[PDB]
Design a protein around this nucleic acid. Sequence first.
DNA 1: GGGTATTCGCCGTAGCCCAACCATATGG
DNA 2: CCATATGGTTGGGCTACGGCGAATACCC
Lengths: 459, 48, 47, 294
Amino acid sequence: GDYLIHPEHGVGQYLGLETREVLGVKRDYLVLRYKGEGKLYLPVEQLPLLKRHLAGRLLVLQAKRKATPGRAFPPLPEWDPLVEKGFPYELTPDQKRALEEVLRDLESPHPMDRLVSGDVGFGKTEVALRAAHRVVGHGAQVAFLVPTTLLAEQHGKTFRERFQGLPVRVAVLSRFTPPKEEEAILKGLAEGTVDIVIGTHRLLQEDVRFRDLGLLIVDEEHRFGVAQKERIRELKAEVDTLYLSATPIPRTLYSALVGLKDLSSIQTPPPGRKPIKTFLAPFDPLLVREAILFELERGGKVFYVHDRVASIEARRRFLESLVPEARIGVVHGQMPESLIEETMLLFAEGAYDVLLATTIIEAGLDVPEANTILIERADRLGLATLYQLRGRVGRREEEAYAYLFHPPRLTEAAEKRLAAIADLSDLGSGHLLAERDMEIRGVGSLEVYTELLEEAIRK
Amino acid sequence: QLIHKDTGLIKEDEVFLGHIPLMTEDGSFIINGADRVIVSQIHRSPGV
Amino acid sequence: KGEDVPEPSVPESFRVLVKELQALALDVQTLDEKDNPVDIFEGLASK
Amino acid sequence: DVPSKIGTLLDLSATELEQVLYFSKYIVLDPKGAILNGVPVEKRQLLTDEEYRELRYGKQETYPLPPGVDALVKDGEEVVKGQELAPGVVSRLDGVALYRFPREPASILVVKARVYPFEDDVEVSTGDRVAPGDVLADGGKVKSDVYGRVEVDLVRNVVRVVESYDIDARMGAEAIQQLLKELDLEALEKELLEEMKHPSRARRAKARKRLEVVRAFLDSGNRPEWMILEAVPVLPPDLRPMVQVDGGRFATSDLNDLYRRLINRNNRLKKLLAQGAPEIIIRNEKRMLQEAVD
DNA sequence: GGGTATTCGCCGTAGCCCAACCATATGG
DNA sequence: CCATATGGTTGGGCTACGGCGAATACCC
Ligand SMILES: Nc1ncnc2c1ncn2[C@@H]1O[C@H](COP(=O)(O)OP(=O)(O)OP(O)(O)=S)[C@@H](O)[C@H]1O
C-alpha cells in the first residue's frame, strides 16, 4: 500500500511479498499493482532497484495584417552598389526582374509578401542578399528561420562571404549552437547589437526578444510545420514577408495563397546548365560499384541516403565491404555539433568521399563536386523531398547521375509518384507543374474566405 | 503471465481476446441481425 | 412506326468478333464466294 | 503453346527461346570464323555474356607484386602460360604484359595480344578489327596474323593487336526476327525430306511435323517474322468500357490497366534509350517490356 | 532401332513510422 | 560549470481425381 516508483516502469503500488513459483525455482517476489491491474512480481534481488515517493483567431489576424500596411521602406539607392560589387557574377534578367519586383513590394507601405520560385540552383540567396542589405541599410534587423541547421551554417558562411566589407553582426542559434553562444546571441540581438540571425526554431521556441521586426525571409515552409506555420504567424505580427519556398504546402494553404501572394517565379534560373541524367532501377550492388567507379573517374562527390530506421554505420561497413576503395562517412543525426561539423569540414577536405546521410535535412547542401546520387528508400518519400534531392545535387559544367531504387516495384502510389518524377527532362518549371498536380492531390475554403474577407475590412 | 525464466520478471495481465458469439435460448445465432444456425458434420472416426 | 421490322446486315457480334481478332494481331479475311474482299463496316471506322 | 512454332522453325527448345527472350544468353547471327575454346562456332548458337565478352574483349589478367621490386618481365614482353613473370608470381594465360608503376613495377597486366614492331606508318587505327593475312603497318610489311582489334603503340613502335573475334550475337526478339528473315523454306523442306529418307522413326516424326508446319507457312503466304510484333494494336475503348457505377467506382476492364502499364513501360524505355543509359537497366527494362506485353 | 505399354502428370474437370527540433535531467 | 541521455513537441510523409498422352521403359 505504497506509492512506489519502479525505476524502469514508473508508477507502482505496493501489495506485499510473494514466494511464488518458477520452473522448479524458489525465488521470492515483492509485488506491485500498476495502472489497470498490472501485477508485476519483481524478484527480491531487485531490492535496491525500486524507490518510494481556435484557428479563426489566427485567420482574422492574417486578414488583418493583410489589410494593414504596417511600415514603408526607403530605397537607399547608393548602398546597394557597394555590396552588389561583392558577388563577382552576372544576374539573370528574370531574377533581376523578380528582385526589383519584390523590392518595390518592400518600398510600398503595404507589407512585402511575395514568393519567387523557379528550378533550383540559381542563387535564390542573391535577391535575399540585396533585400537584406537594404533592410540593414535602414538599420532594420534580418532574421532567417531555416529548415536545417546545416543550411543555417552554410547560409552563415555565405553571408560572411558577403559581409566582409559590411559591419553586419551575424549569428546562428540552433540546438547545434553551444549554450554560452546561444544565450550570448540571445543577449546580443535582444538589445540588437547582433544584426542578422539564422537558425532553427529555438529562435521560435525560446522566447527571444527582437529589436526590428521588419523583414522575415523563410525558405522551405513545406517541412517547417503546420502549427509551426501558426508559430510563424505569431512571429509575423506587422512584418514584411519573403518566402523562398519553391516547394510549397500541398494546397492546404497554397490554394488560398495564390491571389494574395504575387507568385514571382523565374525561368531558366541559371544559364550554362545541364539536364540531370537520371536513371531508375531496383537495387543492385554492382551498379553501385560501377557508379562509384564513375565518380572516382570524374573525381566528384557522392551523396547516399538511407531510411535511418536502423543504424547506418553497419550498412556503411557493408558498402565498404563492397567498395574498399573510397572513404565513406555517415552524417547521421542525434550527434553533437562537433561530430557534424567535423564531417562537414572533412568533406570540405574531401578525403572522406561518400556522404552517407539519411535525410534531405541531413543533406540539403549545395556541395559543388557532387554529381552522383543514389537512393534506396525512394518508395517512402514525399515528391517534394525527392526532387529536392534531385536538384540538391547539381553544379555548372557537369552532368549528374541519379539512381533511385524500387524494392517492391509495386506500391502504386509511389509507382505513379516515381512515374511523374521520371517524366523529367531538365530545368525549367517542370517542378512547378509537378507541384500543381501534387497540390491537386493535396486538397483531394473559398466560401468562408469570402466571409472573412468581408469582415476584415470592418475590423 | 509473461514469465522470463532467468530474471524472474512476471508481467501478469488480463488481456482482451476479441468476442465469441453466444447461442440464443432456443439454440440459434444472431449474426449481423441475420438468424443463422450450425449443422452437425458427420465423418469417419479416428483410430485404427 | 407500324410496319415489318427489317433484317440487319453485318452482325453486331460478327463485327466485334472481327475487331477482337484484329486486336490479336490476326487478320481475318471476310470473303464472298469469289474471293473479293467484302467490307462489312461500309468504311465507317476505317481509313 | 507446345510445340513452340518459333522453336519448331528455328530449331531450338523452349528453354533456349526462354533464355534469348528473357536475356539469359546470346544467340549468334554470323560466326565470322570465330571459335569457342577450341571448337569453332556455328549458326543458331547459345552463348553466355561471359563468353560473349571473352570472344569480344577477351581474358586479361592483372597481378599485384611487392612494392619497389623489379619483375622478370619487362614492358611489352611476350609471356608463356606458366612463366614466373614476377619474382614470385606464376603466369596464368598467354599474351603480352604491361607494367603499372616503376621507380621496377607495382602491378602487371597480361593480355591476349600479338605484337608486331612497326617502323614506317600504320595502315589502320586503334579499335579496327582485322582477320589474319591482312596488312597492318609499315606499308603492308607489318600485317595482321590473328583475328583481333588493333592498338598502335608509337612509344615502343609496336602495332599490337588484342586477339579477339568480331562475332555478332544478340539477345532479343529483334534477333529472333533477324533469324526469321533468313529462312529459305525450300532447302529447309528438302532437307526435311532427307530426314524423311532416314530410317530413325523419332527424327522422322519430328522432321515430319516440322515439314507440315513449314508447308503451312508455304501455302498460307506469310513471313514468319510476322510472328514478332513491333506495333501492337489498340482496341476500341467502348469494348473496354470503364464506366461510372452509382457508388462512384468505375466498372473497368482490366485491358485499360494493361494498356496503361504497357504505355508507361514503353515510353519509359523510349526515354531511357533517348539518353544512352548503362546497359544493365536497359536489359532489365526490356525484360519487363516482354513481361508486360506477355 | 521399330514396336508396346506406362505411369504419372498435368489438362480438364483507415491506421501508423520516422525525421528534425526543442527541453529537462544528468553525469566529469 | 559544462556536456550528454532520454522526453516529449510538432512535422513531415508513409502502409485434388478421370484420363489422353508421352518420354521413357521394356522387348526382340
Ligand atoms: N546570378 C546568378 N546566376 C546564376 N547562378 C547563380 C547566381 N548567383 C548565384 N548562383 C549560383 O546559384 C547557386 C546557389 O545555390 P543553391 O542553393 O543551389 O541555389 P538557390 O536557388 O539559391 O537555393 P535553392 O533554390 O533553395 S537549392 C550557386 O551554385 C551559385 O553559384
